[PDB]
Amino acid sequence: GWIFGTTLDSKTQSLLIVNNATNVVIKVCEFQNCTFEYVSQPFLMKNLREFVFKNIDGYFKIYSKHTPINLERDLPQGFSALEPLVDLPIGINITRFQTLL
Amino acid sequence: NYLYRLFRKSKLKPFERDISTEIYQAGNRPCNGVAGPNCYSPLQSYGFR
Numbered sequence A: 001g002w003i004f005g006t007t008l009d010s011k012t013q014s015l016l017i018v019n020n021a022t023n024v025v026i027k028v029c030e031f032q033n034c035t036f037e038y039v040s041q042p043f044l045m046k047n048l049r050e051f052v053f054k055n056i057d058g059y060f061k062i063y064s065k066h067t068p069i070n071l072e073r074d075l076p077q078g079f080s081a082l083e084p085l086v087d088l089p090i091g092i093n094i095t096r097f098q099t100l101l
Numbered sequence B: 001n002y003l004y005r006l007f008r009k010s011k012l013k014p015f016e017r018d019i020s021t022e023i024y025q026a027g028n029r030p031c032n033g034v035a036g037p038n039c040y041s042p043l044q045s046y047g048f049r
C-alpha cells in the first residue's frame, strides 16, 4: 500500500491504504481519533500496474489499469488509458507520501 | 465549550480539517511548548452569554 500524510507517525493527520493478497482490503484508517472508515473489494486484480492518486478539494481520486508488459526494461511505447476506481473525501493535507514495502 | 482557531502559518484549502494544537510562532524566539511573549495558543475559547 501507500502511506500519505504530513508527518510519519503523529502530530498531524495520516492515511493508510495497506492491503494484502487474499482479501483486497481498502481499509482507510484515520486514527491520527478515528474520523473516516471505509472498506470495499476492488483495488487490485510480467504485468505493469499503472496508478494515479490525486488530492483536489479534499477528494482522493484513484485510477487503476492493468496492462501486460513485454521487454520490461525501460518503459513501453504505447497507449493504455486508466479508469476511475475509488473516490475518497478524506479532507486532509496529503503533504508527502511513502510506499509500503 | 466552543473554540476557534485564529492563528495559522497558511490559509486553509477547501474541505479540509486542522485539529493540531501547537503554540504559534508570532515572533522570532521559539515557544518550545510554553506560551509567553510573541507566543500565543491558536485555540481561543468562546465566551457566549
Ligand SMILES: *[C@@H]1O[C@H](CO)[C@@H](O)[C@H](O)[C@H]1NC(C)=O
Residues within 6 Å of the ligand: A092, A093, A094, A095, B010, B012, B013, B016
Ligand atoms: C499543507 O500544509 C502546508 C504547510 O504545512 C501548506 O503549504 C500546503 O499548502 C498544505 N496543503 C494542502 C493541500 O492543504
